Amino acid sequence: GAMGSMERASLIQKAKLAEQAERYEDMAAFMKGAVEKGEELSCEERNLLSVAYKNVVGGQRAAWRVLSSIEQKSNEEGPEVREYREKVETELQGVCDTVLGLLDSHLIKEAGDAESRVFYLKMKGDYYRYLAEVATGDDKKRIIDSARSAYQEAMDISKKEMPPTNPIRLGLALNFSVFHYEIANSPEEAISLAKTTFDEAMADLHTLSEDSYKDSTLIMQLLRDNLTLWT
Amino acid sequence: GAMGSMERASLIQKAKLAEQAERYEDMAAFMKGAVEKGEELSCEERNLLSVAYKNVVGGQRAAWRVLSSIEQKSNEEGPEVREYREKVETELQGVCDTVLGLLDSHLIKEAGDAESRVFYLKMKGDYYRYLAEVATGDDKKRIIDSARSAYQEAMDISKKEMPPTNPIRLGLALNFSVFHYEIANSPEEAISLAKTTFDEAMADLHTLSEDSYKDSTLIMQLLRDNLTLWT
Amino acid sequence: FPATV
Amino acid sequence: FPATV
Ligand SMILES: C=CC(C)(C)OC[C@H]1O[C@H](O[C@@H]2C3=C([C@H](C)COC(C)=O)C[C@H](O)[C@]3(C)/C=C3/[C@@H](COC)CC[C@H]3[C@@H](C)[C@H]2O)[C@H](O)[C@@H](OC(C)=O)[C@@H]1O
Ligand SMILES: C=CC(C)(C)OC[C@H]1O[C@H](O[C@@H]2C3=C([C@H](C)COC(C)=O)C[C@H](O)[C@]3(C)/C=C3/[C@@H](COC)CC[C@H]3[C@@H](C)[C@H]2O)[C@H](O)[C@@H](OC(C)=O)[C@@H]1O
Ligand SMILES: NCCCNCCS
Ligand SMILES: NCCCNCCS
Known part of the structure; x- marks a missing residue:
């Protein structure tokens, strides 16, 4: 092109x-x-x-x-x-x-491979979520469901194929939790997802090399920031 | 269009x-x-x-x-x-x-009117100066002289028609001083211009209303910052 | 707004 | 770089 x-x-x-x-x-x-x-x-x-x-x-x-x-x-x-x-x-x-x-x-x-599959499905949920933020017509419900379905497929794969400290798994959970809160009017689901994601990753930090997970550390801080903003 | x-x-x-x-x-x-x-x-x-x-x-x-x-x-x-x-x-x-x-x-x-004339001539010197920053061919000298001529005409008018605390007069002096330093390889001229401009405006701050010259105050700080960087 | 990545 | 306005 x-x-x-x-x-x-x-x-x-x-x-x-x-x-x-x-x-x-x-x-x-x-x-x-x-x-x-x-x-x-x-x-x-x-x-x-x-x-x-x-x-x-x-x-x-x-x-x-x-x-x-x-x-x-x-x-x-x-x-x-x-x-x-x-x-x-x-x-x-x-x-x-x-x-x-x-x-x-x-x-x-x-x-x-799981890593790329979850990465692209997270992106699909993100870009459908941005379309949902501005959607005002009879199409809004379908756009929201397209974002949910992409995030949900990504979540299903990441829980089966990735450790809880994987930055893509953490980032997906951070964004799906924001989708629940801001788009789907489900604050309880958003809070439960951020809390379980943070807790599961905290318990797995014992297996990681010291300077190898700066991205996961940053994402964990963002989950904590959202949990503080919401609770 | x-x-x-x-x-x-x-x-x-x-x-x-x-x-x-x-x-x-x-x-x-x-x-x-x-x-x-x-x-x-x-x-x-x-x-x-x-x-x-x-x-x-x-x-x-x-x-x-x-x-x-x-x-x-x-x-x-x-x-x-x-x-x-x-x-x-x-x-x-x-x-x-x-x-x-x-x-x-x-x-x-x-x-x-002097205010608009100096404003547009300052802009002409600024945009010729940006072209001079990237000029590398047999045209560079003419571009630099076009910036100088615009700034010089603006300076001539501003000294005759505007008080020394006028923000357009101050801003023009700030930029013409930077042109001397960075473009024309004339650091002594750049320093002399910033110093005289700052000094003349300081002596005229006695005539101004308290909250009416926040722009001139900001430009005077920028002249001082450049003078500190250069001396 | 909440943070996303 | 020096400041301009
Ligand atoms: C242009 C990309 C550059 C600047 C080269 O890299 C951006 C970053 O790229 C990687 O980080 C990713 C990554 C981000 C990290 C949180 C950045 O980490 C730090 C410590 O700054 C944010 C980015 O937007 C990026 C690429 C995206 C995602 C996100 C993608 O969804 C589809 C899911 C979570 C996150 C993953 C993929 C991160 O691993 C690296 O792990 C980071 O390096 C370190 C030391 O953590 C680097 O800063
Ligand atoms: C989009 C424009 C907005 C944001 C509305 O205005 C920008 C600003 O517009 C005015 O300020 C001008 C002005 C600037 C001031 C230094 C901003 O002052 C403060 C206190 O923030 C910087 C701007 O780029 C602007 C418009 C440009 C010039 C420059 C133009 O050369 C051709 C010469 C000096 C300066 C003059 C024209 C300033 O008066 C006003 O005096 C400022 O308000 C106050 C209270 O000082 C306002 O912030
Ligand atoms: N500054 C280089 C960043 C590399 N990030 C990991 C790519 S998977
Ligand atoms: N916020 C309004 C800014 C007005 N600036 C003066 C225009 S000459």
Whole structure:
């Protein structure tokens, strides 16, 4: 496509340069180009894909939240705030559909190993959850159920194939717990999931090498932060 | 053009929403659309134009600096870093040419009052200075002289028509001093300009209303910061 | 907002 | 880098 004439190795190299330069839109385009070469991504490459799209959609979601808040105040006791909120919303939806399309056309069906399978299903739940945050029509329930089904399949695999301290297993639980709280109006399920996830991982920290799990340590702190915010 | 069908008031309103949402690329596009309506910008509108483009080019310059540094290390004792640095550089150059085109087609010739005239000439010097930061060919000397000539014309007007505490006069001196130091290899001129500017403004703070000059106070701190960095 | 990763 | 505005 757009990145069709560039070597896969060059796209990966340029994705890493774009990350160092904080050019996440370029990083996402290079990683989409690399996925479109048709080869399975490695662990480092999967992280590059996720960071690039999480940063792009993160910025759009922050903007949508600001606009939505201004719009809510303007409708209390002109068309511009609504028009601009809809423009941002359509751009955000376009990015989520691009990620969901890559997941469902390339990445998910070819992922056989548990680590990659859970990683891509977590991403599918995340991008359906971002679409649910802005969904307001007769489609909202189906979008929410698509996020739930992706997270649930990922949870089923991670509990069977990964240790409780695996950062992908922990990150999935962190995000599925947030989905329960913010999207599915299930705060009790969100709290139970974060508590059991934290407790199970704490009991398994005895098996790990000292400087090998900085990511799991950071995710465990985020579960604790959410549990403090909610309880 | 792209914003041709939107009312000028709606473009200004949307530029303000984009600022609150930190969507500086959208903010710049809305402000370019507003300039293209052909009416002179007000003081508040001029600030919106400047903030939008300063943030867009700021991000590109930060990225160019990261890439240029990686490129410099790769040429000490593949083509990807150079290719990507050139891509960023061409995008940065395109934004500076867009701003310079708006200044030279709309804004500068119509500005009769000192405040707007100095504001636009400061912008012209700034965007020529950003082009000089990346200039490497037989054109570099002319680009540097275009920045100098814009800053010098702005300085001549501001000294005649504005008090020494006027934030536009102070900001111009701050930036022209940085041009002398970083672009024209004239550190003595940069230091003399920052010192005289700071000293002249300090002696005029006696004439100002207490909470009316927070911008001038911030610019005076930036002159002091540069003087500390350089001396 | 709650934290996600 | 030095500060500008
Ligand atoms: C662009 C990627 C770079 C910056 C190179 O790597 C990002 C990070 O990549 C890895 O970390 C992952 C990872 C993150 C860690 C929590 C970061 O850890 C620290 C200590 O900073 C956050 C990232 O967004 C990323 C890639 C994503 C996920 C998330 C993906 O869902 C689909 C699930 C949990 C988490 C996993 C995959 C983490 O292992 C590494 O384990 C991190 O290094 C260490 C020492 O922990 C590195 O900072
Ligand atoms: C989008 C614009 C918003 C955020 C609405 O305004 C930005 C700011 O706009 C004004 O400040 C200007 C201004 C700046 C001030 C230094 C900001 O002051 C404070 C206290 O934050 C920085 C901005 O980039 C801006 C608009 C630019 C310039 C610069 C333009 O060159 C062509 C020359 C100096 C400076 C002048 C024009 C400043 O007056 C105001 O005086 C500021 O308010 C106060 C209380 O100082 C406000 O924060
Ligand atoms: N700075 C290199 C980061 C490597 N992260 C592990 C990839 S699976
Ligand atoms: N928050 C409103 C900022 C106004 N700045 C002065 C415009 S000349």
